[PDB]
Symmetry: C2
Subunit: 246 residues, 2 copies
């Protein structure tokens, strides 16, 4: 002094062997709108995501929020007992109109081949860098069943499974589990137990109220999109047995 | 520079304004062991933390895990409905023996002025960088009331409160709240409701069993350590009103 030394002085001589990434899940969404309105919604006004996949050919991947920052895409959410997933997730939005109501039922919009071709390498890149296992790459509908229905019944989950990115029944397993069930439908409590085992937030009351029906429906929309009304049936029970968790 | 990306090609022309930190909470711990052994455990064992505050004079602050990484300090935990807090918290360990059981009962170990003088500016620095509010700087006992007691009944929470770091009753407020109560002890249900509002995982049964007693006790250990037996009383009710939640 001159100027005398003062202030904080961290000792950084030691670094722990036991640490990993704060990012534990990747969550997939659709935007429900076109490219320019997607960019509008995802940059101001309170909703955001880390990546946006455009609807061009080839499909542009925009980075909107750095991976080491928290984007606001999950809201009220739960997967495998982990709640409020924003802080521990990476969110990927895909340009897609979602659905339209018609007097005959909802009609959804398809995802392009180019979009799937851009998404798969992106997911491999993120999963490898953060050590994210396939059971933790899920949709907004998985973590907020009933409240959210994206990426919807037209999303080609099996294409992701083929690339090793999400759990999927092995060949012949659906048929084996159907034979195991032997035509007898398990009760609602059994469906609730199975869904929770897969990671879903679901009541364990043994009674089929809207909150349980919404969870059954989310699972159906992902694995048996032909019918996702949330009604227990034999095929859904077989899929609850057939889809791996490991 | 000198390397291209290992990942897919990205468009970075757009950046979202709606983003913030992945770090939501700061959790305080004591080590229950001496300085050199604490450094050993936190560097080479199953437990880790971002910072360690020594029991030397002045108190050395070690950084053991980068803030952008997940350390393993919280275990099964919940605060304000957020579960599994490792991925979303910064963990700070303080060298202190914790407690010791004797025939005259349990005894506790004090924290030193040197430790407090190192902890306060550290907390200010972290809280400012990550935008962490006072209600989210908490102890292991707060997030795991059934399992953990640290930092215990001797931890100087009020010193942190004087520096604007944690919630604490304003002068005169406890007396005013005691007066609003007008001699009437609220029922157990009311106690459970206030504790959940403050952030605790607590049953909502209206019955006073062990889990509710553990939570009332954790709150008492922090705000009324003269008695933390988990029993509802007028003073604890008054504190549940006087300690602000916003």
């Amino acid at each position: 002094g001159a100027f005398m030394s003062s202030g904080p002085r961290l000792n950084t001589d030691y670094t722990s062997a036991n640490q990993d990434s704060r990012v534990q899940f990747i969550v997939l969404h659709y935007t429900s709108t076109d490219l320019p309105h997607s960019l509008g919604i995802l940059t101001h006004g309170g909703v955001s995501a880390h990546y946006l996949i455009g609807d061009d050919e080839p499909a542009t991947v925009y980075r909107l929020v750095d991976e080491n920052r928290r984007a606001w895409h999950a809201g009220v959410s739960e997967w495998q007992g982990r709640t409020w997933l924003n802080a521990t997730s990476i969110g990927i939005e895909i340009v897609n109109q979602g659905y339209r109501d018609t007097p005959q039922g909802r009609v959804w919009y398809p995802f392009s081949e180019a979009q799937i071709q851009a998404l798969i390498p992106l997911l491999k890149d993120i999963a490898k860098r953060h050590g994210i296992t396939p059971d933790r790459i899920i949709g907004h509908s998985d973590i907020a069943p009933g409240r959210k229905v994206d990426p919807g019944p037209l999303f080609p989950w099996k294409r992701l499974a083929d690339a090793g990115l999400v759990p999927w029944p092995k060949p012949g397993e659906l048929a084996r589990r159907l034979a195991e069930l032997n035509g007898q439908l398990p009760d609602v409590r059994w469906f609730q137990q199975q869904l929770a085992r897969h990671g879903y937030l679901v009541p364990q009351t043994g009674e089929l109220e809207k909150d349980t029906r919404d969870v059954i429906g989310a699972f159906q929309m992902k694995y048996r999109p032909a019918r996702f009304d949330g009604e227990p049936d034999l095929e859904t029970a077989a899929l609850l047995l057939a889809v791996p968790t490991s």
